Amino acid sequence: APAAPDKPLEFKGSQKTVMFPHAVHAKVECVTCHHQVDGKESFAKCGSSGCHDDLAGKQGEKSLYYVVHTKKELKHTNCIGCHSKVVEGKPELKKDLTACAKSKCHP
Ligand code: HEM
Ligand code: HEM
Ligand code: HEM
Ligand code: HEM
Numbered sequence: 001a002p003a004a005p006d007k008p009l010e011f012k013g014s015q016k017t018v019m020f021p022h023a024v025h026a027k028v029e030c031v032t033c034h035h036q037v038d039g040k041e042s043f044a045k046c047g048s049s050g051c052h053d054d055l056a057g058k059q060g061e062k063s064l065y066y067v068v069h070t071k072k073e074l075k076h077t078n079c080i081g082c083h084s085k086v087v088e089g090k091p092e093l094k095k096d097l098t099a100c101a102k103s104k105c106h107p
Helices: 064-069 079-089 091-098
Strands: 009-012 017-020
Touching: 064 079, 079 091
Parallel strands: none
Antiparallel strands: 009 017
């Protein structure tokens, strides 16, 4: 598989840009986020054509917003989902990892 990016990268929606750092997630297997597609590995951008390419809508499988933010139980692990589990044991990180404003995702 390709190498994991060294520097934080721009993970964009239609209005906001969130800096995503791989370094901090080094203990997380790649596939956790870069889920398999049709039985094969995939490292394409989440919102590329044919994937979660609805960058404005907030509901549905095609919605990038939805797969990133929903707390519902999904087929694959997502951003808010794992962060919520993490803060159950580390409450001191609740604001930094799950808050809608003033968090590490949305400063
Ligand atoms: C808290 C539950 C929370 C809210 C609400 C929220 C809102 C939000 C908006 C309105 C956008 C802009 C969408 C767009 O540009 O089209 C947005 C985008 C991203 N967010 Fe968010 N967000 C909340 C929380 C968090 C947290 C705690 C993280 C990080 C784990 C996070 C991540 C992202 C990412 C990535 C984006 C860009 C991709 C996209 O969803 O379009 N948000 N968020
Ligand atoms: C595991 C060690 C791992 C690899 C390999 C990896 C690779 C990778 C690449 C090459 C990109 C760049 C994609 C591009 O076309 O620019 C990329 C981007 C993102 N990754 Fe990743 N990644 C690995 C692990 C992880 C883990 C564990 C997560 C989630 C916690 C994750 C997530 C992301 C996100 C988000 C992006 C941005 C994609 C976008 O649409 O902008 N990666 N990764
Ligand atoms: C990019 C790193 C990336 C993220 C983030 C992402 C998340 C995601 C979640 C959490 C699910 C489960 C949704 C649900 O259960 O309702 C999910 C599902 C699918 N994805 Fe995805 N996804 C990322 C990347 C990609 C890419 C690059 C494509 C397109 C090639 C893609 C496609 C799909 C499809 C289709 C589904 C539904 C089938 C499934 O595997 O669950 N995603 N994604
Ligand atoms: C989903 C693609 C996703 C995003 C977006 C995301 C963002 C994020 C940020 C911005 C941080 C803070 C970095 C900093 O300290 O400056 C962060 C930190 C942790 N994350 Fe995350 N994260 C996403 C996904 C995931 C997933 C799927 C998991 C769990 C499997 C996960 C876990 C963590 C953990 C652990 C941290 C570090 C907490 C700490 O001790 O500081 N993230 N994430």
